[PDB]
Amino acid sequence: MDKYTALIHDENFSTLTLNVSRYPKSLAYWEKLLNYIVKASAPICKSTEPQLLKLIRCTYSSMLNEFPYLENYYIDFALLEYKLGNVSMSHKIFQRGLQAFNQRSLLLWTSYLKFCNNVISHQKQLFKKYETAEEYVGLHFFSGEFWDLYLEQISSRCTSSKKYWNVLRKILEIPLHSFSKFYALWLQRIDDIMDLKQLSQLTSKDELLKKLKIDINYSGRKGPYLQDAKKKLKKITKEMYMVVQYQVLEIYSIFESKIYINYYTSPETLVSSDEIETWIKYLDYTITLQTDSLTHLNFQRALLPLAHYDLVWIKYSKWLINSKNDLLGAKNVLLMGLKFSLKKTEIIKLLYSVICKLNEYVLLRNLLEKIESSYSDNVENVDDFEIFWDYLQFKTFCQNSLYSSRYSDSQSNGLLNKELFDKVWKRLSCKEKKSGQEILLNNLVQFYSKDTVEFVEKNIFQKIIEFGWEYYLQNGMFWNCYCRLIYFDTSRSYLDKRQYIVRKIWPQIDKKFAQSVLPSLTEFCESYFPEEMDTLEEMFT
Amino acid sequence: MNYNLSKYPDDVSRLFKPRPPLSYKRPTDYPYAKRQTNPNITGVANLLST
Amino acid sequence: MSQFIYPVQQQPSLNHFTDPNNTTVFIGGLSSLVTEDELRAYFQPFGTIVYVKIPVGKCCGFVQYVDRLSAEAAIAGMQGFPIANSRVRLSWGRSAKQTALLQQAMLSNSLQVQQQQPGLQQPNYGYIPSSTCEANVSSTMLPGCQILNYSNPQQVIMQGSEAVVNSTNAMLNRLEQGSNGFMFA
RNA sequence: AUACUUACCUUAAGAUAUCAGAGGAAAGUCCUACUGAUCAAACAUGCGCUUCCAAUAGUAGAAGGACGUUAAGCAUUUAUCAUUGAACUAUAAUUGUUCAUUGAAGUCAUUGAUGCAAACUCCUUGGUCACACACACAUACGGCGCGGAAGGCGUG
RNA sequence: UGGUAUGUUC
Numbered sequence: 001m002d003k004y005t006a007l008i009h010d011e012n013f014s015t016l017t018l019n020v021s022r023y024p025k026s027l028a029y030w031e032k033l034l035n036y037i038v039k040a041s042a043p044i045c046k047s048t049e050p051q052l053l054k055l056i057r058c059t060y061s062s063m064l065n066e067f068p069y070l071e072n073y074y075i076d077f078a079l080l081e082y083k084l085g086n087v088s089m090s091h092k093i094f095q096r097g098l099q100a101f102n103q104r105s106l107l108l109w110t111s112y113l114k115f116c117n118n119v120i121s122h123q124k125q126l127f128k129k130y131e132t133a134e135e136y137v138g139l140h141f142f143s144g145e146f147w148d149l150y151l152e153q154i155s156s157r158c159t160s161s162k163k164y165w166n167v168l169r170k171i172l173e174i175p176l177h178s179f180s181k182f183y184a185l186w187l188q189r190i191d192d193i194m195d196l197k198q199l200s201q202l203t204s205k206d207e208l209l210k211k212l213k214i215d216i217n218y219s220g221r222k223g224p225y226l227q228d229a230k231k232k233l234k235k236i237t238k239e240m241y242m243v244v245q246y247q248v249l250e251i252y253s254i255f256e257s258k259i260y261i262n263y264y265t266s267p268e269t270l271v272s273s274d275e276i277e278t279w280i281k282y283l284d285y286t287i288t289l290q291t292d293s294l295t296h297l298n299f300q301r302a303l304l305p306l307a308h309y310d311l312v313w314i315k316y317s318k319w320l321i322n323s324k325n326d327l328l329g330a331k332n333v334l335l336m337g338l339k340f341s342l343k344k345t346e347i348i349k350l351l352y353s354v355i356c357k358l359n360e361y362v363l364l365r366n367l368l369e370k371i372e373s374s375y376s377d378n379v380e381n382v383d384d385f386e387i388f389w390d391y392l393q394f395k396t397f398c399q400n401s402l403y404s405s406r407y408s409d410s411q412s413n414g415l416l417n418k419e420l421f422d423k424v425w426k427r428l429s430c431k432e433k434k435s436g437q438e439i440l441l442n443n444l445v446q447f448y449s450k451d452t453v454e455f456v457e458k459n460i461f462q463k464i465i466e467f468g469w470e471y472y473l474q475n476g477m478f479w480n481c482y483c484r485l486i487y488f489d490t491s492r493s494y495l496d497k498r499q500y501i502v503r504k505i506w507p508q509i510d511k512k513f514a515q516s517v518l519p520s521l522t523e524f525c526e527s528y529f530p531e532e533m534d535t536l537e538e539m540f541t
Numbered sequence: 542m543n544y545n546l547s548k549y550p551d552d553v554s555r556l557f558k559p560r561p562p563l564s565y566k567r568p569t570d571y572p573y574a575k576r577q578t579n580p581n582i583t584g585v586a587n588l589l590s591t
Numbered sequence: 592m593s594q595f596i597y598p599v600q601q602q603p604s605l606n607h608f609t610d611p612n613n614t615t616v617f618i619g620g621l622s623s624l625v626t627e628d629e630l631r632a633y634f635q636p637f638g639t640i641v642y643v644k645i646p647v648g649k650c651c652g653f654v655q656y657v658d659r660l661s662a663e664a665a666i667a668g669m670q671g672f673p674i675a676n677s678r679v680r681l682s683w684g685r686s687a688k689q690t691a692l693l694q695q696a697m698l699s700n701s702l703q704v705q706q707q708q709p710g711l712q713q714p715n716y717g718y719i720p721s722s723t724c725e726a727n728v729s730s731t732m733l734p735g736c737q738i739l740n741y742s743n744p745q746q747v748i749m750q751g752s753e754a755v756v757n758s759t760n761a762m763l764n765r766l767e768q769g770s771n772g773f774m775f776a
Numbered sequence: 777a778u779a780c781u782u783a784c785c786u787u788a789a790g791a792u793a794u795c796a797g798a799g800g801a802a803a804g805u806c807c808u809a810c811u812g813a814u815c816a817a818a819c820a821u822g823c824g825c826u827u828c829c830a831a832u833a834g835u836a837g838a839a840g841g842a843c844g845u846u847a848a849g850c851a852u853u854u855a856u857c858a859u860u861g862a863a864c865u866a867u868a869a870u871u872g873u874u875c876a877u878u879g880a881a882g883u884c885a886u887u888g889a890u891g892c893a894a895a896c897u898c899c900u901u902g903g904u905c906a907c908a909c910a911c912a913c914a915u916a917c918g919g920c921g922c923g924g925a926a927g928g929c930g931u932g
Numbered sequence: 933u934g935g936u937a938u939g940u941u942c
Binding site for chain 1: 733
């Protein structure tokens with residue numbers, strides 16, 4: 001047998017593979033399984049077993065579907081595909097990894113350009129990749145290493161040397177962590193100017209004559225005139241340095257000193273509360289500055305330690321809603337936040353409402369169908385009530401709009417529809433195992449019309465009476481909601497409803513339950529029936 | 542140039558930094574398999590009569 | 592020596608404005624018709640509140656949040672909002688004991704030195720800052736969920752899935768009961 | 777530095793201008809601070825030899841670049857192969873057309889490539905020398921100032 | 933009668 005079959009009949013490959021297959025999201029299992037596979041190929045070469053190489057590519061690519069933000073493994077899968085020889089697949093792995101991060105990542109752009117340098121060999125296109133990298137990641141606080149790459153490529157390839165000045169003048173205004181280095185390059189590269197015509201490298205001719213009073217066409221003794229010119233340009237650089245030093249020292253001292261973790265780890269890692277607080281404040285600072293490249297970069301840069309939380313998926317969505325006025329942008333942010341975050345309830349709530357504002361109701365129907373399908377057409381039985389209740393509100397909006405009303409005065413039947421009322425009754429029938437009983441009753445009360453009040457009274461109030469469910473009968477909120485259903489009927493007159501509540505409803509409750517029911521029922525009575533407050537107190541003592 | 546296969550220290554090997562890689566240009570000659578002088582060298586005996 | 596050196600800067604002498612840890616908010620311009628519970632109802636949703644107090648007659652109040660983040664959301668959120676017909680001026684202030692110490696130092700005019708408000712003791716992993724809980728838990732502590740929180744007054748309780756019920760539940764209470772008059776706040 | 781220890785080596789030959797004439801050690805060899813003729817090199821040295829050497833009386837220009845911009849300029853042209861299922865046109869095993877599936881490779885590019893053309897910006901280079909601001913010339917044009925660069929030819 | 937190389941001792 002070959003090295004592949006010796007690998008596939010190993011005892012360890014069964015357990016490592018099988019632990020990954022049991023626990024897909026835990027990632028120490030994926031890393032042990034992958035390290036073992038790669039190590040059992042003693043030397044990776046162009047002649048190692050093609051079944052074994054196909055097994056390696058399947059392992060890394062499935063891990064990069066499960067955990068799309070691991071930057072270092074996109075780089076490692078690209079370098080492995082380089083060593084095997086085909087630089088085209090390694091191009092596609094770097095571009096796939098850049099795509100996972102919406103183009104906005106410094107490590108992947110830095111490594112993709114250090115790679116690209118060797119293998120492009122077409123100069124206009126190699127430089128167009130640096131001009132693409134610079135618009136997405138160029139304003140990063142740690143982006144000095146990118147600009148070193150761009151400047152060394154310019155200084156080797158270009159013959160003219162105007163492009164170096166034109167790039168370095170832009171770099172002079174970015175508040176980078178290593179901003180001084182490029183000020184020192186500009187100062188040395190000014191200091192080596194050896195005549196007047198070189199000063200047209202720096203800026204334009206007219207700006208020198210008008211703003212700084214330097215004439216390049218000055219014919220005369222040109223020595224001291226040049227020393228005066230260099231003194232003036234060193235002063236204008238001093239003021240620009242002073243601005244950028246204020247920016248950089250402010251950003252470092254408040255915010256960037258405080259963040260310690262800059263990279264995605266695994267869906268099971270926690271972040272300290274300090275870093276959550278300074279990421280929230282640092283995003284607020286960035287949004288104030290109003291540089292949109294830099295706000296998008298800083299949200300993407302902030303999703304790395306805390307992709308799986310959801311406070312920044314919500315926050316980035318809100319910034320797109322109200323500060324940029326963009327709802328399709330915010331839908332795409334929240335929709336992508338479903339993939340990452342573990343909580344998902346606040347995102348689904350806000351995404352339902354973003355879709356409803358975007359007038360795309362069929363997508364809302366599909367998300368409601370996927371949430372009822374995810375619980376096996378049985379959302380009524382979910383332990384966590386917030387899923388069921390948000391589902392049910394937006395499903396009711398779709399349902400009132402979809403089926404015309406059955407009751408008078410165009411009173412849209414919300415929970416009184418045979419599809420929805422069966423879910424509500426099926427959750428009411430579990431009585432203590434489920435969580436959200438009083439909220440569900442308390443929203444069923446709100447109909448206020450004679451036809452609607454009669455249906456709600458007969459189906460949930462009379463029926464839980466006659467079944468004798470002790471949970472609902474001992475509970476004060478049940479009786480309070482029933483009295484409040486009848487009392488706010490616009491149909492019944494005052495004597496009718498007071499007659500009904502005191503004479504029909506209040507005898508029905510048992511006297512053993514008085515110690516449980518009388519706190520709430522008194523609170524109804526004093527609020528609306530001060531006159532009958534003796535009767536109640538007499539009925540239960 | 543992260544590494545050095547040379548005998549020199551790193552500072553000396555940075556001095557031997559090469560030019561950028563050569564650009565690619567499409568060939569104007571014959572591919573190596575198609576190279577041949579003349580085949581169909583015609584015969585010498587036809588001259589001898591006339 | 593070398594052309595690159597680390598920057599060095601002077602300290603700004605520690606009052607209540609330059610303290611990075613300060614979580615208490617001076618609300619000024621209070622209307623003298625507004626109680627402590629009514630002001631708690633204004634400044635509650637921005638965070639969990641260690642204490643709320645109003646000086647007798649002094650037309651100003653204090654709100655001490657647990658987080659710095661919560662307090663800054665308060666000052667940005669309620670600035671010049673008219674609490675009972677008078678616009679309200681919010682700023683950083685100090686506590687009660689620190690105020691008593693500054694007044695006794697203001698009579699003797701001796702030093703007027705402040706000290707720094709305590710910090711949490713970083714790193715804390717369970718806590719998501721600026722998040723509130725109102726009232727048998729088997730928590731798995733997975734990261735999106737909120738493992739830990741501060742009890743409303745004071746204790747440390749673990750948030751559950753069930754708490755999003757309880758808040759909603761209590762919400763309907765003060766829509767009903769406070770409508771009739773049983774809490775003005 | 778010395779010294780000592782090892783390890784690796786310790787070789788293609790031959791020649792130094794040619795032709796002719798006189799001499800010395802019948803054929804040839806060798807040699808001659810011998811003699812002619814040719815050749816080659818160096819160094820001096822000349823030719824009415826030939827070509828080239830930038831405004832300041834002005835804001836220029838000449839030669840060569842750009843791995844420079846306008847620029848996604850303007851005009852054309854390109855972006856896989858096999859297997860299986862389905863509809864489909866049809867003279868047709870289903871040749872044509874569309875959709876999906878398995879396998880195989882696969883430089884990046886399409887804002888590319890190729891064709892055409894123009895403007896602009898900028899780099900390096902030079903006697904930016906001296907006397908002149910001049911009416912010339914058919915044998916067509918004093919090549920009758922000092923240098924420099926490069927060759928052609930001649931002499932010693 | 934040699935050369936380069938190596939490492940030890942002083």
